[PDB]
Structure formats: C-alpha cells, structure tokens
Structure 1
Amino acid sequence: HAEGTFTSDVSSYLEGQAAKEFIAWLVRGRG
C-alpha cells in the first residue's frame, strides 16, 4: 500500500498543463 503521484503534480497544476497547452497554439500562430 503506497501513495500516488500528486505531491509533485500539485506544484505543476498551478501553471496548467493540459489547459495552458493551448496557449502554445495562439502564441505559435496568432501574431
């Protein structure tokens, strides 16, 4: 019985992975 991945990911969600992933689209083809 062990814990799952979160202690680390909890620090990345602050920036947004999947969501913000879109920011790359606009920035890379929107002026």
Structure 2
Amino acid sequence: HAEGTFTSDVSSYLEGQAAKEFIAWLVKGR
C-alpha cells in the first residue's frame, strides 16, 4: 500500500473486471 506500492494491482483488477457490464451492453442491449 502507499499509492503505487502494490495497491495499483488490486484496483486495476477491480476496473479490468467491472468493465464487462458495458463491454457486453452493446449486445446485451437488445
């Protein structure tokens, strides 16, 4: 922890994961 100090990963992962919702929306919209 200490903004860079590992923390980066865990967060980026949350982001990288979350994205799906919209990534798929464009199909999972009809």
RMSD: 4.8
Percent identical residues: 97
Task: Name structure 2 gaps, 5 residues minimum.
Answer: none
Say which one has the larger Rg: 1
Structure 1 residue runs of 4+, over 4 Å off? 1-5, 17-30
Deviation string 1:1-31 (CA, Å, 9 cap, x unpaired) is 999963211110002279969959989999x
Structure-2-length-normalised TM-score: 0.23
| Number of aligned positions between the proteins | 30
Matches within 5 A, 1:6-21: 6-16=6-16
Task: Name structure 1 gaps, 5 residues minimum.
Answer: none
Higher RCO (C-alpha under 8 Å, 6+ residues apart): 2
Structure-1-length-normalised TM-score: 0.23
